[PDB]
Design an enzyme around this catalytic site. Structure first.
Site, mmCIF file in Angstrom:
data_model
loop_
_atom_site.group_PDB
_atom_site.id
_atom_site.type_symbol
_atom_site.label_atom_id
_atom_site.label_comp_id
_atom_site.label_asym_id
_atom_site.label_seq_id
_atom_site.Cartn_x
_atom_site.Cartn_y
_atom_site.Cartn_z
ATOM 1 N N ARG B 60 -20.232 -29.879 16.901
ATOM 2 C CA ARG B 60 -21.053 -30.898 16.268
ATOM 3 C C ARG B 60 -21.923 -30.238 15.217
ATOM 4 O O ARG B 60 -22.595 -29.251 15.516
ATOM 5 C CB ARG B 60 -21.946 -31.556 17.328
ATOM 6 C CG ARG B 60 -23.041 -32.439 16.753
ATOM 7 C CD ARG B 60 -23.822 -33.122 17.864
ATOM 8 N NE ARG B 60 -24.913 -34.007 17.398
ATOM 9 C CZ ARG B 60 -26.229 -33.693 17.408
ATOM 10 N NH1 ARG B 60 -26.681 -32.530 17.878
ATOM 11 N NH2 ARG B 60 -27.093 -34.529 16.863
ATOM 12 N N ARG B 107 -41.360 -42.186 7.871
ATOM 13 C CA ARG B 107 -42.223 -41.003 7.854
ATOM 14 C C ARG B 107 -43.641 -41.385 7.399
ATOM 15 O O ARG B 107 -43.821 -42.305 6.580
ATOM 16 C CB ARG B 107 -41.695 -39.877 6.940
ATOM 17 C CG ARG B 107 -40.178 -39.687 6.914
ATOM 18 C CD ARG B 107 -39.565 -38.316 7.133
ATOM 19 N NE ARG B 107 -39.909 -37.877 8.484
ATOM 20 C CZ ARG B 107 -39.369 -36.943 9.274
ATOM 21 N NH1 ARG B 107 -38.106 -36.566 9.219
ATOM 22 N NH2 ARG B 107 -40.194 -36.385 10.150
ATOM 23 N N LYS B 257 -24.085 -43.940 17.260
ATOM 24 C CA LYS B 257 -25.160 -43.431 18.115
ATOM 25 C C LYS B 257 -26.126 -44.572 18.418
ATOM 26 O O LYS B 257 -26.660 -45.188 17.464
ATOM 27 C CB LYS B 257 -25.947 -42.279 17.482
ATOM 28 C CG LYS B 257 -25.044 -41.107 17.141
ATOM 29 C CD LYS B 257 -25.686 -40.064 16.238
ATOM 30 C CE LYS B 257 -26.998 -39.424 16.768
ATOM 31 N NZ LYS B 257 -27.607 -38.524 15.755
ATOM 32 N N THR B 315 -27.898 -35.093 25.177
ATOM 33 C CA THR B 315 -29.289 -34.716 24.896
ATOM 34 C C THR B 315 -30.029 -34.346 26.178
ATOM 35 O O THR B 315 -30.141 -35.169 27.085
ATOM 36 C CB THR B 315 -30.065 -35.781 24.109
ATOM 37 O OG1 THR B 315 -29.314 -35.944 22.910
ATOM 38 C CG2 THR B 315 -31.459 -35.271 23.713
#
Ligand SMILES: O=P(O)(O)OC[C@H]1O[C@](O)(COP(=O)(O)O)[C@@H](O)[C@@H]1O
Ligand SMILES: O=P(O)(O)OC[C@H]1O[C@](O)(COP(=O)(O)O)[C@@H](O)[C@@H]1O
Ligand SMILES: O=P(O)(O)OC[C@H]1O[C@](O)(COP(=O)(O)O)[C@@H](O)[C@@H]1O
Ligand SMILES: [K+]
Ligand SMILES: [K+]
Lengths: 518, 518, 519
Positions: B60, B107, B257, B315
């Site tokens: 990955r 952000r 995802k 994860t």
């Protein structure tokens, strides 16, 4: 929909999984008991009150370290914190005290006469193990002394020896009278007085050490509720612990810690003799390949559930929370899966004893457990438990299973159970209802010990015994109703199941009523 | 007994758990694909060769960081390592390359005009969020600028806003024209340009960023096998990704995802449009309560299994191994439970990208996966998959399910499948046989992509096409037999199931043979 | 929807019942074999041709009556009728021939010297049973002679004795050397030479009577396909029948008739020794309480299904049709429930042998069986058969179960199986697919014997062996395709399952193909 009820209705396990819904909120009640190791991080009265509010049900004292004086003071603090809530019996939560024994050990000697010096063991090198006490303070890269005088009797050529929590690995190449010539498999730094494990051996160390005998006596004096007995290998080990506890300690529950190959293989005889089981994953994963620990965990939880005996999932469940305010995703999953497996209780060790975030770790176990309880596939679980169980003439058993069935049919907010010894409530818990089991007792020890069983919310009735027994029963039922209302388990008009018996002593539970909450 | 076959025969799930046996060793084959994130710890040719030997199936590349040049070099290194084994076709293992997009982000601005300065947020204080660009470099404890121009449209009074890795939490108290007055719930040190999460919001950022479009183009040029597309919220997001990949990229698999509330809620439409799914637990657990992650994970794995589409568990699976040579008990459990859930693949992120023990992490995932594969309750799983699946006129489907049934009946050592596109092998894997599926293909992309599916061991046939088709088929069957023998999957005289079709070209698989291993 | 497919999909048996649909028509194929007793009503060549067209698969000859000459002529007629269809091999149906033995019996003597005279037995009266042959022709209301010399060794005080098909009942009150004093429980008219039953006794009559020996010899000479052996009580009785048949009769299938308490109790050892079983309800319901016969029936059918051995449900299934053109509602139900139970075959006795409506009775069994076959809950049945089955190294078994699973997945029109001995097709039938099993064989005896298994439609290939084995296999598969098309089992483009092996000779079935029906 709430409580994963959509998932609850699936006709297959696969569909059950497909229906799990993050937007389906759980009920208020959390059924899985939380056991917290008390240490420097969690021992003040002030912190302990918060531990209780955050969900701690059982305080574990680890007798691997600390004096009797130190432990006596911890227990004093736990009781002070616990009793600070006693003025409102509706809100008081019983808290149990568990003594976890050091247990027998194998230790190496001193390197080079020092406690702090270390030596390097190279993969493939020779290392001789000696029992000769002349070398007990002259351990080096060539000669390793250890304190287990019978080691030679219990290993063979080909046997492995693990040193320092499985850091170093040795294979026996030759056996002598009082020595073993080994080859280093996994090398590393060998320090002083390190722990030795004998994977696959029938180790003949006593069931209880000299220190354990003193500690168990002290637990009796201290009125502890249960003992977590280390390194249980066989039924006779449980018998020895029971005999030490003696007549005076006869009501203390013995929870056998399964922590090596022998304990796993002799599990059935151990369970039969014990009041319950701890899956002691820490030591277990030193003794057996780490990749096999989940097998032994699910084996043990399944067989405990089949036997109706409490089982605890222990060790590293939220390990990262020693240092961080939030767990890893693997940790969240571990706690959820332990509850899904069937564990009665889950445990925190360093997370509560010494870490920086003890309260957060308790709260997290509470949050996860409650989500996971909703996600159990009760439709299959209840079918299997009922089939796997005997037919008996025992009326209390018939009453318990009938109450559980009734609780599923009406989605009740609770099963209320009057119990002297705890047994009637334990009999309900063994069938794994979704509804919380409010066990009303006057017996403080019953109340504390009931935390061992999934689903039991023990409440301690302090009222005098009323002259008319029917009123005395109604008083206790009404107490349970007030508890459930105050804790948000249910509200007026919701339906609940109530279990009572036909006369006052233990053993007569035979009456099930389906009633609206007043 | 071996492979948990005693447990396999239990008539209930409960008994199945009770029979799991640490002394029952697994088969050689490991069915669950291992995906490893490449970074400084794992990018050298030398380490990559060991990653392959240790069990890596998919490299990955995380395009959250690194230039095109960096990633081009990673891919080159992975191919160099991969091809170093090509000289023995019996033993060569295909290795896929996956591009994982940065995806859209929200952000904050700069604290004191500085990148490094920080400010303290007090729990309960006011913090106003502004879109006013005058404050884009004057963020402080009173005024926080962020770059999401539509934020006001997608939050309400009562909404939460999370900042950093969910480190800071804000509750919206007032909405204005251009601004939001919030109260700080969880305080902490606020630095510069931190990630913002909007739990429960329908965020309308583009499906693919400007940078993502460039990166996908580069993935096409670089011949990647699959894309892990970030922050997929809806089917149209998948359609956008597919359109960017275009005609040239039509055979690259898109793995969506799932990382927020919207993605979970819109899961069905996303699955239908995708080639597969990643349970992106890291971001998922920032967006939704950590205690709810396991629900989303099991939901997604179950639904993917029901649809026959690959699913990855990602994860923190072995997080502690970033720093330590051995995993925690919760990590061991997480890996095992992911495979038990039904995950086609499991993943490593920092454990392989930057940790001190990348090889040990791969080896540990291999060990656990193989133990957990044996512990699956195939008796119930197969019954449910068969019932949940349609009746079809598709001959290849009837062949695949017949092969899986036959494989259980004779305990075969393998199901051998000739396949051009991979589809016939995929159709077998969706019924979750115990036996490994050796998928023989001449198509190198097929071979690499097959790693997405539980149980497929892809083998790349290099021999020329034989003049007579029957000889050509037999040659590939023989190749599979030799692969299984060389890898220890089975030995002479074991039985294996062989799937072929009645003519060349995709779509004609219709023939199932039960053959002894020669 | 058709074939009760909506019910087929139910998640519970209760829901399956709730979904059964009188408006959901069945498929053409009927899987349950029909066994018809041939007698005066059904023995002409002309009637036999119609019995075949109406659905008869097995002709049963009852050797309780009739000379060898009579039975030989019946068999000749069945073959004439069967072969009248041979000129089109696509349409020819094999017809098996079964010999059903008279078997050992206990008989009383003559009343008052006469064959026709009778006497009245009053409830509560005394009746002495004598073995003394002086009384063999002086039976009256006081003294009953019977021919079972060992009776006293096998009954006790308290034992019941049943006389004339259980019409009369006696209870043993006292035992002597050569006599029994009894009390009459159920009275009635006692005539001459009546049948005696000994409920609960371990009766030690020979496995085979003197007449049975003659009849078995005749069965071998006449090339019968199977024997239904009467009054089987224990495995050694089966072994004796097998030994009598010997080498010449080694391929004749032995179907044990279970007709008393001992046979039911020793069922397991009997099944293991037999090729199949007949639930012989007529005699069974004389020997045991009538209300218990459904228990023995379901026990035997379930255990035969578990063993993979043929079981026949027999006797009074459509009794009223001896005299009437339509059956009662209980009879319709009995046939349907036998098929639901799992019976491989159902049987007609006087309905076809002597009644007024033999063709109607065969047609009605066909109609009911086909409706019942669709109403089977295959979802649970297949799950249970698969679980109850071993894990096996046997590749033929793996192939058979894979084929049956594939047949459910694609709703196939048939499972086509090449078989020499029948075994490959038997192995498929034991998993109880919905789809018909077309068993192609060149072996005529295989073809006839295959009727014993639920679902097998045997087809007899008459083409020469082709020089290339591949072509020879293909030719037989093509034959099966043509049979299914002509019989309306399936049409061009439907999907069917085909089972073959990897080389010639028995025992190599290992290949399962899913094939569209060609044009
Ligand atoms: O669970 P145990 O110990 O059998 O106690 C249950 C008992 O409690 C009761 O409800 C009330 O008993 P007491 O009034 O003595 O507490 C009995 O009727 C019943 O037999
Ligand atoms: O000789 P080829 O063209 O590889 O075909 C071999 C067999 O592989 C299959 O193509 C399977 O390929 P797919 O899985 O892509 O359908 C069959 O249809 C065919 O008979
Ligand atoms: O060409 P043959 O000898 O009839 O055989 C064709 C196929 O029939 C089978 O013989 C099956 O026969 P059985 O059912 O008696 O085993 C296979 O083994 C064989 O491959
Ligand atoms: K301890
Ligand atoms: K321990």
């Amino acid at each position: 929909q709430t409580q994963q009820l959509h998932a609850a209705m699936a006709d297959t396990f696969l569909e059950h999984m497909c229906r799990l819904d993050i937007d389906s909120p759980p009920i208020t009640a959390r059924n899985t008991g939380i056991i917290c190791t008390i240490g420097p991080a969690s021992r003040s009265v002030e912190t302990l009150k918060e531990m209780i509010k955050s969900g701690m049900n059982v305080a574990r004292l680890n007798f691997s370290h600390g004096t009797h004086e130190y432990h006596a003071e911890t227990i004093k603090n736990v009781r002070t914190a616990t009793e600070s809530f006693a003025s409102d019996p509706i809100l008081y939560r019983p808290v149990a005290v568990a003594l976890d024994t050091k247990g027998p050990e194998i230790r190496t000697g001193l390197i080079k006469g020092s406690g702090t010096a270390e030596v390097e063991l190279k993969k493939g090198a020779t290392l001789k193990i000696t029992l000769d006490n002349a070398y007990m303070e002259k351990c080096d890269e060539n000669i390793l002394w250890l304190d287990y005088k019978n080691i030679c009797k219990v290993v063979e050529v080909g046997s492995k020896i693990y040193v320092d929590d499985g850091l170093i690995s040795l294979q026996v190449k030759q056996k002598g009278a009082d020595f073993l010539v080994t080859e280093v498999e996994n090398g590393g730094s060998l320090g002083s007085k390190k722990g030795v494990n004998l994977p696959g051996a029938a180790v003949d160390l006593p069931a209880v050490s000299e220190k354990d005998i003193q500690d168990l006596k002290f637990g009796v004096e201290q009125d502890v509720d249960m003992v977590f007995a280390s390194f249980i290998r066989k039924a006779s080990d449980v018998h020895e612990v029971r005999k030490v506890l003696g007549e005076k300690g006869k009501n203390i529950k013995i929870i056998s810690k399964i922590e090596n190959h022998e304990g796993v293989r002799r599990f059935d005889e151990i369970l039969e003799a014990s009041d319950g089981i701890m899956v002691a994953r820490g030591d277990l994963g030193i003794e057996i390949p780490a990749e096999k620990v989940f097998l032994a965990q699910k084996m043990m939880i399944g067989r405990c559930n089949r036997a109706g005996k409490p089982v605890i999932c222990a060790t590293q469940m939220l390990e990262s929370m020693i240092k961080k305010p939030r767990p890893t995703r693997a940790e969240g999953s571990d706690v959820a899966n332990a509850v899904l497996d069937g564990a009665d209780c889950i445990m925190l060790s360093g997370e509560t004893a010494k870490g920086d975030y003890p309260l957060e770790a308790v709260r997290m176990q509470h949050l996860i457990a409650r989500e996971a309880e909703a996600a159990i596939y009760h439709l299959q679980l209840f079918e299997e438990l009922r089939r796997l169980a005997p037919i008996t003439s025992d009326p209390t058993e018939a009453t318990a299973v009938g109450a559980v069935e009734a609780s599923f049919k009406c989605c009740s907010g609770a099963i209320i159970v009057l119990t002297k010894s705890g047994r009637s409530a334990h009999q309900v818990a063994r069938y794994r209802p979704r509804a919380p089991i409010i066990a009303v007792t006057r017996n403080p020890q019953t109340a504390r010990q009931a935390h061992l069983y999934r689903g039991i919310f023990p409440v301690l009735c302090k009222d005098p015994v009323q002259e008319a027994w029917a009123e005395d029963v109604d008083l206790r039922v009404n107490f349970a109703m007030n508890v459930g209302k105050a804790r948000g388990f249910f509200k007026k008009g919701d339906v609940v199941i109530v279990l009572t018996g036909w006369r006052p002593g233990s053993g007569f539970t035979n009456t099930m009523r389906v009633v609206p909450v007043p």
